[PDB]
Amino acid sequence: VRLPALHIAARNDDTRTAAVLLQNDPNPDVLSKTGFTPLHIAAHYENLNVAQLLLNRGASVNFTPQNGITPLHIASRRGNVIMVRLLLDRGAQIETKTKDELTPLHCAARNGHVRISEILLDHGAPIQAKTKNGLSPIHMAAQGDHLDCVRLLLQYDAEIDDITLDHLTPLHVAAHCGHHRVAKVLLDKGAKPNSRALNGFTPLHIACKKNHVRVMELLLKTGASIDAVTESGLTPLHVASFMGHLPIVKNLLQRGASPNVSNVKVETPLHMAARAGHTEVAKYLLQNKAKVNAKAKDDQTPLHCAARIGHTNMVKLLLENNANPNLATTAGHTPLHIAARE
């Protein structure tokens, strides 16, 4: 359950113990239980002396365990610039992929190591290489809020609108994670603000979903469509009203988003605020424009949706403003019949 002695000497950078061990056992590529050579441990802790000692005794600079993590991968992930240089000088392969198809550039960009990424690019690393999910290094840089890494990769002609398997652009990832600085750099460099995901989600839709207000303002300022709909017809106010993010719902209504838009299910933003139960969104949706007695599929008012879930503050806001209890669905169910049912 203890590491092999050459792995322990690698972690401690003990070149004297390593020299004695290699004199006794001439194999520098001894495997641990995980399958990692001592060169992998030296690359992780940037022990350059024991790394050169191991490489001078025949250690495989391109050793590939079962998971595909070469020492160059570890050095790039850990930010070991000097170890990356040493491994590249001794013949490390620049395009080798892990089990999940990550290149060393993927590991560098995911952790935002600008210097290492530039060294790998200058050595010919593929900037458009993809993982199993279709993530390019710029996707990993945008996911980690690594502004200078998005900035360097864009300088090296990375595709600003590359898509994953879920049709996610780096702008989509930035909107998802709330990184408004990455989104600002991408949009100021020509990224399309109305890119569609697999379900037709724009970056504005995702920003309105996750209550990322700064990304929302940046997108709307860089010409994102405020009335863009999904495959299901969801506007950004449908997403904001359903998720309950009052900052987004007020910002979208101050800018002139129609609070009376519909979806495949003829649902309006006040219907989704009644079904979820956000009485401060609904309150704003009415204060502005929104039809308290508006109807959807089956002839359902927001009073019906609020009475189904049993929210009384919502019922009491809808009923106080203009809601009429006597309105009934196609099956004849008033809000008093749903409330009696539940």
Binding site: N133, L135, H176
Partner: peptide
């Protein structure tokens, strides 16, 4: 203390094998 990193379990935890994998591409279906 000061000798835990010499064990295979601690080293595997230290090497962070999950950081060399594509975790997921979440969508959060509404």
């Amino acid at each position: 203390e000061e000798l835990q990193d010499d064990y295979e379990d601690m080293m595997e935890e230290n090497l962070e094998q999950e950081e060399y994998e594509d975790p997921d591409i979440p969508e959060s279906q509404m």
